[PDB]
Every structure is written in C-alpha cells, then in structure tokens.
Motif scaffolding. Sequence first.
Motif, PDB file in Angstrom:
ATOM      1  N   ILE A  83       6.778  22.052  -4.280  1.00  0.00           N
ATOM      2  CA  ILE A  83       5.997  22.066  -5.506  1.00  0.00           C
ATOM      3  C   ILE A  83       5.809  20.628  -5.965  1.00  0.00           C
ATOM      4  CG2 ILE A  83       5.917  22.721  -7.914  1.00  0.00           C
ATOM      5  CD1 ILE A  83       7.488  25.200  -7.271  1.00  0.00           C
ATOM      6  N   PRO A  84       4.554  20.224  -6.194  1.00  0.00           N
ATOM      7  CA  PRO A  84       4.294  18.888  -6.730  1.00  0.00           C
ATOM      8  C   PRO A  84       4.260  18.926  -8.256  1.00  0.00           C
ATOM      9  CG  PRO A  84       2.230  19.903  -6.128  1.00  0.00           C
ATOM     10  CD  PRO A  84       3.311  20.918  -5.812  1.00  0.00           C
ATOM     11  N   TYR A  85       4.621  17.822  -8.903  1.00  0.00           N
ATOM     12  CA  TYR A  85       4.483  17.725 -10.349  1.00  0.00           C
ATOM     13  C   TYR A  85       3.861  16.397 -10.780  1.00  0.00           C
ATOM     14  CZ  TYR A  85       5.320  17.973 -15.346  1.00  0.00           C
ATOM     15  OH  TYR A  85       5.156  17.984 -16.718  1.00  0.00           O
ATOM     16  N   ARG A  86       2.686  16.494 -11.393  1.00  0.00           N
ATOM     17  CA  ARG A  86       1.962  15.339 -11.906  1.00  0.00           C
ATOM     18  C   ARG A  86       1.573  15.644 -13.347  1.00  0.00           C
ATOM     19  NH1 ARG A  86       1.490  10.526  -9.948  1.00  0.00           N
ATOM     20  NH2 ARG A  86      -0.006  10.274  -8.224  1.00  0.00           N
ATOM     21  N   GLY A  87       2.477  16.309 -14.062  1.00  0.00           N
ATOM     22  CA  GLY A  87       2.188  16.851 -15.380  1.00  0.00           C
ATOM     23  C   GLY A  87       2.007  15.858 -16.514  1.00  0.00           C
ATOM     24  N   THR A  88       2.906  14.883 -16.611  1.00  0.00           N
ATOM     25  CA  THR A  88       2.793  13.847 -17.634  1.00  0.00           C
ATOM     26  C   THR A  88       2.063  12.647 -17.045  1.00  0.00           C
ATOM     27  OG1 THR A  88       4.704  12.399 -17.268  1.00  0.00           O
ATOM     28  CG2 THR A  88       5.127  14.586 -18.179  1.00  0.00           C
ATOM     29  N   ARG A  89       1.463  11.817 -17.892  1.00  0.00           N
ATOM     30  CA  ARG A  89       0.753  10.647 -17.382  1.00  0.00           C
ATOM     31  C   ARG A  89       1.694   9.459 -17.180  1.00  0.00           C
ATOM     32  NH1 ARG A  89      -0.619   6.490 -19.937  1.00  0.00           N
ATOM     33  NH2 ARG A  89      -0.268   6.174 -22.184  1.00  0.00           N
ATOM     34  N   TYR A  90       2.989   9.751 -17.118  1.00  0.00           N
ATOM     35  CA  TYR A  90       3.990   8.768 -16.725  1.00  0.00           C
ATOM     36  C   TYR A  90       4.495   9.118 -15.330  1.00  0.00           C
ATOM     37  CZ  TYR A  90       4.190   7.272 -21.619  1.00  0.00           C
ATOM     38  OH  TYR A  90       3.883   6.784 -22.870  1.00  0.00           O
ATOM     39  N   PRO A  91       3.938   8.464 -14.295  1.00  0.00           N
ATOM     40  CA  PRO A  91       4.258   8.749 -12.889  1.00  0.00           C
ATOM     41  C   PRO A  91       5.758   8.670 -12.590  1.00  0.00           C
ATOM     42  CG  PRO A  91       2.387   7.275 -13.030  1.00  0.00           C
ATOM     43  CD  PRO A  91       2.932   7.395 -14.422  1.00  0.00           C
ATOM     44  N   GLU A  92       6.451   7.742 -13.248  1.00  0.00           N
ATOM     45  CA  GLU A  92       7.886   7.547 -13.041  1.00  0.00           C
ATOM     46  C   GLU A  92       8.714   8.785 -13.389  1.00  0.00           C
ATOM     47  OE1 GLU A  92       6.144   3.453 -13.300  1.00  0.00           O
ATOM     48  OE2 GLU A  92       5.844   5.389 -14.285  1.00  0.00           O
ATOM     49  N   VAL A  93       8.226   9.585 -14.333  1.00  0.00           N
ATOM     50  CA  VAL A  93       8.881  10.842 -14.700  1.00  0.00           C
ATOM     51  C   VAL A  93       8.487  11.965 -13.735  1.00  0.00           C
ATOM     52  CG1 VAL A  93       9.011  12.669 -16.439  1.00  0.00           C
ATOM     53  CG2 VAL A  93       9.191  10.282 -17.136  1.00  0.00           C
ATOM     54  N   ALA A 153      14.889   8.901 -16.727  1.00  0.00           N
ATOM     55  CA  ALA A 153      13.772   8.130 -16.189  1.00  0.00           C
ATOM     56  C   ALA A 153      13.182   7.175 -17.225  1.00  0.00           C
ATOM     57  CB  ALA A 153      12.698   9.056 -15.650  1.00  0.00           C
ATOM     58  N   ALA A 154      13.050   7.646 -18.460  1.00  0.00           N
ATOM     59  CA  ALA A 154      12.445   6.850 -19.520  1.00  0.00           C
ATOM     60  C   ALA A 154      13.327   5.669 -19.888  1.00  0.00           C
ATOM     61  CB  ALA A 154      12.176   7.709 -20.738  1.00  0.00           C
ATOM     62  N   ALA A 155      14.635   5.909 -19.922  1.00  0.00           N
ATOM     63  CA  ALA A 155      15.599   4.855 -20.213  1.00  0.00           C
ATOM     64  C   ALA A 155      15.677   3.845 -19.066  1.00  0.00           C
ATOM     65  CB  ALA A 155      16.971   5.454 -20.498  1.00  0.00           C
ATOM     66  N   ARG A 156      15.588   4.341 -17.832  1.00  0.00           N
ATOM     67  CA  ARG A 156      15.616   3.482 -16.647  1.00  0.00           C
ATOM     68  C   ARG A 156      14.356   2.631 -16.537  1.00  0.00           C
ATOM     69  NH1 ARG A 156      16.477   2.510 -11.202  1.00  0.00           N
ATOM     70  NH2 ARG A 156      17.793   4.210 -10.400  1.00  0.00           N
ATOM     71  N   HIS A 157      13.198   3.286 -16.505  1.00  0.00           N
ATOM     72  CA  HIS A 157      11.917   2.583 -16.423  1.00  0.00           C
ATOM     73  C   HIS A 157      11.484   2.020 -17.786  1.00  0.00           C
ATOM     74  CE1 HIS A 157      10.900   3.426 -12.187  1.00  0.00           C
ATOM     75  NE2 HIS A 157      11.453   4.612 -12.374  1.00  0.00           N
ATOM     76  N   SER A 158      12.437   1.991 -18.719  1.00  0.00           N
ATOM     77  CA  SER A 158      12.348   1.266 -19.992  1.00  0.00           C
ATOM     78  C   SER A 158      11.027   1.364 -20.751  1.00  0.00           C
ATOM     79  CB  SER A 158      12.717  -0.207 -19.791  1.00  0.00           C
ATOM     80  OG  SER A 158      11.839  -0.833 -18.872  1.00  0.00           O
ATOM     81  N   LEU A 159      10.570   2.587 -20.999  1.00  0.00           N
ATOM     82  CA  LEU A 159       9.374   2.786 -21.807  1.00  0.00           C
ATOM     83  C   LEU A 159       9.753   3.075 -23.255  1.00  0.00           C
ATOM     84  CD1 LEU A 159       6.254   3.440 -22.287  1.00  0.00           C
ATOM     85  CD2 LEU A 159       6.907   2.363 -20.117  1.00  0.00           C
ATOM     86  N   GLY A 160       8.775   2.976 -24.148  1.00  0.00           N
ATOM     87  CA  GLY A 160       8.959   3.398 -25.521  1.00  0.00           C
ATOM     88  C   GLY A 160       9.101   4.904 -25.517  1.00  0.00           C
ATOM     89  N   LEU A 161      10.275   5.385 -25.910  1.00  0.00           N
ATOM     90  CA  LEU A 161      10.572   6.814 -25.836  1.00  0.00           C
ATOM     91  C   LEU A 161      10.925   7.423 -27.197  1.00  0.00           C
ATOM     92  CD1 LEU A 161      14.191   6.941 -25.236  1.00  0.00           C
ATOM     93  CD2 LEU A 161      13.177   5.529 -23.446  1.00  0.00           C
TER      94      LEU A 161
END
Lengths: 75, 93, 207
Positions: C77-87, C116-124
């Motif tokens: 199963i692929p998942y491309r649900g959010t526009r944050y590829p890293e997640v 993932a958000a904490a690792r790839h350091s985005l505004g979360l």
Amino acid sequence: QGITKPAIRRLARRGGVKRISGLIYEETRGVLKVFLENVIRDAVTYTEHAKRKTVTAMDVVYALKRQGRTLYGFG
Amino acid sequence: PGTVALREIRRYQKSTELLIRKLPFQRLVREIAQDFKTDLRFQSAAIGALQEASEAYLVGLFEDTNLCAIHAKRVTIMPKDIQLARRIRGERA
Amino acid sequence: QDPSRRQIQRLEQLLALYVAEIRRLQEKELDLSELDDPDSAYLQEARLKRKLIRLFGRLCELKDCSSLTGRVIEQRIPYRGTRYPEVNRRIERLINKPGPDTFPDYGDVLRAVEKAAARHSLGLPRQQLQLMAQDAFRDVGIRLQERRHLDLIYNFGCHLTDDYRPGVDPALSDPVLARRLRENRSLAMSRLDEVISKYAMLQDKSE
C-alpha cells in the motif's frame, strides 16, 4: 471456554487492537455465536427449501450474501 | 504449478492462515446445530466457508473499533468502544 | 538436469493428487457426531492443505522462485496523503511492515508523524499534527481494511462456490422462501444488536 483467549486476542490484533478488556472475550464469543447462528439459520432455510438433507457450501454462500456487507463484492 | 491453477494454491494457503483452531470451531458449529434441533448435516466446504467468513467478520469488527478509537494516550478496548464504533461505521453483518 | 527434472515432475504429480483428495474431502457431508470428531473430514482436509502448502514451498525453493502466490494482501500500500513527503515515506514504511499482524493503532500513526516532524524539523503546530495524524490513520486504516476484504473475497470458498451468480438466488422467484428469509434477517439483526448492547450495559454496571 471453547474459543480461547489467545485466539480472541490474536483476532483483535489482526484488526489493529493492541489491548482488550476482560469482557471482550465473552463478548467476542457471544458475537461469533450469534453471527454463526444467523448464517446457519439462513443456509438451513435455503437447503430445506430445495428439500435436501445436507447443507451445501452454496447454501452458506446464499446465506452469507444476506448478512449485510460480510461478503460484499463476492460475485 | 503445472497441473494446479495458482488461484487454488492461494486459497489453500489462506486456509492455512486462519486464527481460530479448527476443532473448536467445528464444535461451535456443532453446538449451534444442536440448539437449532437440526436434523441435517453440513458438507466440509460449508464449515470452511463459515470459518473464513466468521474470522473475517470478527477482525472487521475489531478494525472498525480500532478506526474509531482516537485518544491522546493509548486505551484498552472495552465493550462500549465496540458499540460506538458499530454505530459510527455501521453493522458489518 | 534430468534427475532434477524428474524429481520436480514427481513433486508436481503429488501436488495434484493432494489437490484431488482435498477436493474429495471438501465434498463430504458431516453428521452432528462427526462435528465433534478430531479426525473428521474437515480436519483431514485441514492437515492435507497444510502438507500441500509445505510441498509447494519445497517446490518454490527448488525452482529458484519465492513462496509468494500473488496474494492481494501482499500488495504494498502506498501513502502520499499529506503534502509532507518525509511523513508519507514513514507512514508507508509502517503500514507495509513485514508480518500478518501489522495493522496500526491511531497511536502508531501519531507517533510516526511526531517522530518524522521532529526529525525533519518542520514547524509542527500540535493541533495541526494531531488532526493530520487522525486523517492519516483513517485513510491508511480504511485502505488496510479494504485490502483484507478483497483478499477475503478473491480467495474465498472452493470449486463448489466458484459458480455463484447473485441472480440465480431462488429467493427471488419463490416469495415464501423470501418471506422466511425476511423474518430470519430481522431476527438476525435484532440478535446482533442484543449482544452488542448486552455487553455494553455489562461494562456500564462494572464501572
């Protein structure tokens, strides 16, 4: 007592549930028995309609196709 | 894979993967057939179909309950959760 | 490569005989007493299927091929649900974990997103994370359920059921049969609801 705690737990895990409650066991046994009762009752109806002595897998299919969305899409 | 169609093999494999022991399931169907005062018999395929569909149904019920469980801290699934999940996603059977 | 050829010939012959005997056993009608018997036709069929699958695996192992049978439940199963590829990558990783029992809790998904958000350091923004995680868990969970269900209906039954056509239901013709099935259905539904509620008010009493 027949359907074991390990099995019920494993079924729940198969569906994503990590932790179940004490009553969940007795309930899953109740639910299973009622579901089976429903499928059976329908199949037996089907096979008594056609005047036969044995319950065919087809009778079970006709019966299952009437239990909501259980075999949705089959056929 | 010469004299047997792969589909059939997929099927037998899936039969291998069931989660309820087959003997006690047999005994369950037996019990219900006793309570129904059934004068009839069941072909082995029928029992098989019953088991596949039953485990399918139970796992489905649990999936629905899982899908309706949204909590900050992880919770143990209790009867009320099943009830509510069944209200939200609907009775599968 | 002749004794090997003849060997695989043998094993395939045996595979076919196994199949034929399974076909035979599936057709046996079982008395109420047989349904209590440990060696009944159902369990014979069972063990026979087991040893068949074993032989099959042996054959795959002998033919440089993997023991996969092309099951749907095998399909990634692929998942491309959010526009944050890293997640999306991490969630994909999670839902396609090796195993038969890799269905995630909402908690698993939220943990994935937070990690993932904490690792790839985005505004979360936390409320935003929790919402996104809930939607993800729902999407991914729905797809997993659909896959299990397809896997069910595609590999369901046997040769006896393989000829099912919805329009040959005798209940459509015969109104009596349809009536009995109707009453049946109403009992069935009220019974399921009876149990669900029963255990609900039991938990209510316990608390």
